[PDB]
Amino acid sequence: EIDPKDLTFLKELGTGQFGVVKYGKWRGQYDVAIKMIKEGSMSEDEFIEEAKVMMNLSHEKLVQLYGVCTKQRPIFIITEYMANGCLLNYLREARHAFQTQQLLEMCKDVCEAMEYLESKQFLHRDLAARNCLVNDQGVVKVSDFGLSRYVLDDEYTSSVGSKFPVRWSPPEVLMYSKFSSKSDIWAFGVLMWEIYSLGKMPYERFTNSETAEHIAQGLRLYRPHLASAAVYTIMYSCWHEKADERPTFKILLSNILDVMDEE
Template sequence: MGNLNMYRFEGTGFSNIPQLIEHHYTTKQVITKKSGVVLLNPIPKDKKWVLNHEDVTLGELLGKGNFGEVYKGILKDKTDVAVKTCKEDLPQELKIKFLQEAKILKQYDHPNIVKLIGVCTQRQPIYIIMELITGGDFLSFLRKKKDDLKLKQLVKFSLDAASGMSYLESKNCIHRDLAARNCLVGENNVLKISDFGMSRQEDGGVYSSSGLKQIPIKWTAPEALNYGRYSSESDVWSFGILLWETFSLGVCPYPGMTNQQAREQVERGYRMSAPQNCPEDIFKIMMRCWDYKPENRPTFSELQKELTVIKRKIT
């Protein structure tokens, strides 16, 4: 949105988004000179997901995200929700990235994946409306409840994460930022994968990136750090780190090391030792997730099966 409440990419401004789309569709004018992209086939608005700003009332601030604040909200039907807001002064390309999460999530329905309820894009600021998960983020949960968490519960959390990631794997979705801080704990202590801001859906199963800012180095697989190659296999590496966080009850990975030191040590073959009281079969899974060769790592489908067996053994 430009001056005088006009919508534009570059050049001519329009008073509403449909006019802007119609202009680019009929004239075949490039969206931006830099991208060279031309609008060939505008996709109709999916009414199921589009809400009006008036449909949601913002409540308390829950935290800050990459693009803006996250609030507790309430819909007209009294449903409690989480509302991610996008700062109004962000450049257009970042606003498009903000909506990427909603674009991905609206295709998914799984008990271990956070649910999208809708988006508000008719005016600024843009909102993404998600189900409200009452237990907060998994990392804080682990640290807060560490004295009360039993082995069976930790294995159940791990299985929940593997189930959610196995579902994403089946959909060719690469998360790219799997970590305890990006999982949420819902009712009945069900863990849900969240924070899809860096996620990509790729038909070939591999996503190459050259321009990722703020890469979570201690969670990221070597081939992704070295060559920008992201895949379900690189997500499996991150899952191994998530397991380590889980069984260490929220300790930061590679304790005492900087990001750079951890990266260099991993390249030399170093792998973290098992957290205190971690079962041997869980640690063996971690080590397989951290195989330097992506093709040697287990799939999430295999991990889900293995963790199901381990959970059954625990009384």
């Protein structure tokens, strides 16, 4: 629990599912981002209990939770500040002119974070480039893991809603609500596709409804031009029709390290 007397609010970073997010300073020294949780957007009591478990998730490639302010409304979530913002927008900036080794390093950063979460049996449920952030050193970290469980908005939580992450979901999530480690693995393969496509929307010429149908037929995202055969094999292995045949994050990490050594 952070004392709000130790926070200063300096600039607005944007808005997400729980409302406004600000940049500021904690204890007059540390850069932080601060979510100001919009009334009615969050299952607050449930989140407050989970915040304890979430305080114990700590990894170099996960956005670090610093604390919460819960003795007030709106509640605050205080985290590490990531100077270069969301990965999706960062990929879309042509000026970066990324080498493919830099793209594979971004995939490795995310894979490391997800292998850690997998080892804690903790699902993200909304893994995508829009929910990764980039720091001032260009390191990618995974953000907002586990928080989808507290979203109140039916358009996000329903499979047929306008905000549901359809294009990052495997068939068994869309058809049956079967969430598992293997649904995060599917989403990770879509994220590698976003990275190697420099931020294109997956299934960019289809609607959500048409995407669910294309994937139920066994068809998949095409290889991005910048992805080698080996890189495409890795992302494609995340999209096996049978969930139990998709790799673990530990296997994916080994596969990515092998490709780094090879290429």
